[PDB]
Amino acid sequence: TVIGIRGSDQAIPKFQMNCYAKEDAFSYPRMKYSSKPYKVDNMTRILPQQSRYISFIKDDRFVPVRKFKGNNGVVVLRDREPKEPVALIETVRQMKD
């Protein structure tokens, strides 16, 4: 999972942080480092690696203190600018939880 989350209670603002990996989220079932914007960073395939050829945009409201901690699952774009744009996103949690 790569999901915006927050360094706070989560508006789940999602963004694709876009630093290029040779694309293995595009290598995956049907049915390297260019430091270029990667296409799409939000959840799905990623990879621990294809995580780590990508880096955040600073320009969103929220920024991690850890400088792209590097772990897709752990997500949590740390929350720098709430009650604003970077909109809002929710989940079945937010539904029930």
Add this chain to the structure above:
Amino acid sequence: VIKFRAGVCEYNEDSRLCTPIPVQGEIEIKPNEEEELGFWDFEWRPTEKPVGRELDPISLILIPGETMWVPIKSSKSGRIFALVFSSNERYFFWLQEKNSGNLPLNELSAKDKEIYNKMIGVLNNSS
């Protein structure tokens, strides 16, 4: 507990309201929080989005036995839960579920036929 469809609005001691007032959830008039005392703590909770609002003290206390259901008498727009106790303590619970249309001769409010005699009873019920 006996459950009801509304948020917890601005109680609006006076100055008749139900301006939009999110608190979108289910406020539930119920026998306090212990399900024992004649007190009705009005159980509010979303599985909903109440625009991050409650306006309820985890549920709303009620002083029993003088509680009457004012239908939304002193009519404004659609439903609220209009609990008029002293006409001061008045506790309004924001209309969220608007069902069977606004109907006359129950609440004169947007959601009544179910919830009216539900709110009627639960305030006038023995339990």
